Amino acid sequence: NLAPLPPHVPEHLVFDFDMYNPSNLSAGVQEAWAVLQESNVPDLVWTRCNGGHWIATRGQLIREAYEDYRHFSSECPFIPREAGEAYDFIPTSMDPPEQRQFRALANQVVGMPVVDKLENRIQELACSLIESLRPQGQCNFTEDYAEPFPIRIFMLLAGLPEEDIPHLKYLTDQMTRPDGSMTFAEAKEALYDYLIPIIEQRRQKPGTDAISIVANGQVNGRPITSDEAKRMCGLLLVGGLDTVVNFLSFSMEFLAKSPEHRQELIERPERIPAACEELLRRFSLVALGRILTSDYEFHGVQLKKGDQILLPQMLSGLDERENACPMHVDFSRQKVSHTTFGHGSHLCLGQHLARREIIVTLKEWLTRIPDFSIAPGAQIQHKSGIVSGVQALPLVWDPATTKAV
Ligand code: HEM
Ligand SMILES: CC1(C)[C@@H]2CC[C@@]1(C)C(=O)C2
Ligand SMILES: [K+]
């Protein structure tokens, strides 16, 4: 419901946006969040939803606050407060200076050198999955590709069995888009319950998988503790299971609904990397926050020590002040401004893996299934939270005018 207005918040800044169920969700989730950028809405508002918190609505403020970790701390980075307080993943829940030492280790397991070598496998799985679907003339894209493609790449990287996916995906989703059956703290404890014995097993008998590497890792030259390893591995499993998975569905829904854009990439395949960047801007999907470390006047608004502020990564690139005609998709956009992978010291470490998964998907899908559309009479429903997504994406095409590679 609505939390009592704190005594320091003026009524004129109140805009009761619900990040877990925004009122304009039927329009599309990005559209739903973009109501915060209508001309009469201030740059910084307070919502009484979800326990009460600030929201920065414009790219300028969102970038500034992400750079300023001294005032805007990552120690409580989720709304609602009980979720941010419980949240202890590494490096996400840390500020510099301590955060920094943990990035090199995360880089070892998800960074460019890993991705470079993940190459043939990512390519082979994309092709296999898509070829299987091609002669059917239909699929449920979320379950048939968006989930298994990035999730199998991740489970392989992490040396975790594929049969564990349903459990782990359910838990991850409770942390970003809870259905109400579990608190964030319960979902996180269940993830840790899974991870703890595995981490100990791989500290005793190390492999070459990501969990082994983290569990046996060093951080600025000293051994990682079991606790830190667990906190880092939890983050890796959320990144693997609930990021690219959602983004692929926004992108494919857009392509299903825009033949002209499909044609563009079929005719000019070299534009695929640039298209990936533009789609990352338009279909940005993450919204994290920070907590005030002190009372602080920010852009004319009095923020109080301990207030939470939602800083939607999603919103920077949709801001007309960053990109003209922001809801319009233009693969030839010359300065594609966004903070889709974050901003400041926590810039996404998985972004190279994510782009490779996106670009491989766009190329290999359009090769095999160039012409597809939304299933007859389907109304595509989005879902909103810390990471937003697509509930279901039924697609159809005529298989007779397709062929195997
Ligand atoms: C479309 C895909 C993705 C998006 C939009 C995305 C977004 C983000 C964002 C916004 C942050 C910064 C949050 C903050 O302010 O602390 C971040 C951090 C991070 N991401 Fe990603 N991410 C994606 C994919 C991945 C994947 C696939 C992985 C690994 C499998 C991953 C691993 C990480 C890690 C380890 C960090 C922590 C960096 C730090 O706190 O220093 N991400 N991501
Ligand atoms: C905000 C994120 C996308 C980033 C990586 C996974 C995620 C849900 C986090 O907890 C940190
Ligand atoms: K915390």
**Residue set of the binding site for heme:** 348
Resolution in A: 1.6
The per-residue DSSP string of 227-278 comes to HHHHHHHHHHHHHHHTTHHHHHHHHHHHHHH-HHHHHHHHH-GGGHHHHHHH
Q: Ligand 1 centre and the CA of 208: distance in Å?
A: 22
Q: What's the CA-to-centroid distance between 104 and ligand 1, angstroms?
A: 14
Separation CA 351–CA 104 (nearest Å): 15
- Whether 174 lines ligand 2, by a CB cut-off of 6 Å, is no
Query: Which among 45, 43, 92, 84 has a CA at the least distance from the CA of 64?
Result: 43
Q: Residue 342: which residues within 8 A CB-CB, separation 6 or more?
A: 66, 286, 288, 313, 348
Exposed e or buried b per residue across 238-269, where buried means at least 16 C-beta atoms within 10 angstroms of its C-beta: bbbbbbbbbbbbbbbbbbbeeeebbebbeeee
Confirm or reject: Cβ of 387 under 6 Å from ligand 1: no
d(CA 283, CA 76): 26
Question: Quick check: CB of 106 below 6 Å from ligand 1?
Answer: yes
Measured distance CA(211)–CA(205) in Å, rounded: 12
CB count within 10 Å of CB 163 equals 8
Find the farthest-apart pair of alpha carbons in the chain and give their distance in angstroms, rounded: 66
Q: What's 391's domain CATH number?
A: 1.10.630.10
- Domain span at residue 288 reads 1-405
> How is 300-345 classified by DSSP, letter by letter?
TEEE-TT-EEEE-HHHHHH-TTTSSSTTS--TT-SS----TT--GG
Indicate the number of domains in the chain.
1
Q: Which ligand is nearest to the CA of 94?
A: 1
The answer to whether 348 and 203 have CB atoms below 8 angstroms apart is no
Residues around the ion ligand 3 (C-beta < 5 A) = 87
Nearest C-alpha neighbor of 308 from the set 126, 52, 42, 27 = 52
State how far the Cα of 44 lies from the Cα of 55, in Å rounded to an integer.
6
Experimental method used, please? Answer: X-ray
**Atom of ligand 1 lying closest to residue 99 CA:** 41
In angstroms and rounded to an integer, the radius of gyration of the C-alpha atoms of the chain is: 21
Beta bridge partners of 14: 46
Ligand nearest, relative to CA of residue 87: 3
Asked whether the CA dihedral 254, 255, 259, 263 is positive or negative, the reply is positive
From ligand 3's centre to the CA of 297, what distance in Å? 24
Residues contacting 352, CB < 8 A, separation 6+: 111, 112, 115
Residue 2, token pair as written in the block: 């609505």
